[PDB]
Amino acid sequence: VNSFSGYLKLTDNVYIKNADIVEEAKKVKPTVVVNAANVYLKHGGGVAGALNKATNNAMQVESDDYIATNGPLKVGGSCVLSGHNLAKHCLHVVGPNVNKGEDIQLLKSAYENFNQHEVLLAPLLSAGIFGADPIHSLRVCVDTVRTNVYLAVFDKNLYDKLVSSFL
């Protein structure tokens, strides 16, 4: 048992809710919140801008030190950093950005990072400003992640479409 509340169960291990991931994280304080990161950990907008804003820019300060030491992430890759006031840890995962021409095939590799964590609160990778089809992202999530994932979908119209079209 865990404290995630109000989720619809899609599969044995995937759950979904119409929610603002920032407010969800602040309420639950999960072990892991997933950020929709880019390879530079520049948290300017979308989910990343919102998570970073909620940390009062502490996420960005930590991220800049990470990049200065390690260089950029790979598309499809991830790193574990602090969750600050939102979670114990933040798993920064880079899904392909279709608006940059990145290979959508890398979305499966991106979701594989979730399997290193038993339970996660996460957005749909490559959705939103990353330009992929969220219906597709949900399908890849369900067919790739084997650990327990609680998906937060900000947009109510999208949430309803994702549920109603789910196979």
Ligand X SMILES: C[C@H]1CCC(=O)N1Nc1ncnc2[nH]c3cc(F)ccc3c12
User: Using an 8 Å Cβ cutoff, are 76 and 109 in contact?
Assistant: yes
Nearest-approach distance from CB 65 to Cl ion, in angstroms = 25
Choose the one of Cl ion, ligand X, none that binds residue 121, judging by a C-beta under 5 to 8 angstroms depending on kind: none
Among 119, 129, 158, 163, binds Cl ion (CB under 5 A): 129
Nearest-approach distance from CB 70 to ligand X, in angstroms = 25
88 strand-pairing partners: none
Nearest-approach distance from CB 22 to Cl ion, in angstroms = 12
123 binds Cl ion (CB under 5 A): no
User: Using an 8 Å Cβ cutoff, are 34 and 25 in contact?
Assistant: no
Q: List C-alpha distances in Å: 97 to 15, 93, 118, 128.
A: 24, 12, 26, 10
96 binds Cl ion (CB under 5 A): no
Three-class SS state of 32: strand
Size of the residue set binding Cl ion (CB under 5 A): 3
Choose the one of Cl ion, ligand X, none that binds residue 155, judging by a C-beta under 5 to 8 angstroms depending on kind: ligand X
Choose the one of Cl ion, ligand X, none that binds residue 86, judging by a C-beta under 5 to 8 angstroms depending on kind: none
Is 76 or 123 the residue whose CB approaches ligand X more closely?
123
Q: At what angle do helices 134-144 and 156-164 cross, to 10 degrees?
A: 60
Binding site for ligand X (CB under 6 A): 20-22, 36, 46-47, 49-50, 123-124, 127-128, 134, 152-155, 158
134 binds Cl ion (CB under 5 A): no
E-assigned strand segments in 12-147 = 14-18, 32-37, 78-82, 89-94, 119-122
Nearest-approach distance from CB 95 to Cl ion, in angstroms = 11
Nearest-approach distance from CB 132 to ligand X, in angstroms = 9
Instruction: Read off the amino acid at residue 46.
Output: G
Q: At what angle do helices 46-54 and 21-28 cross, to 10 degrees?
A: 40
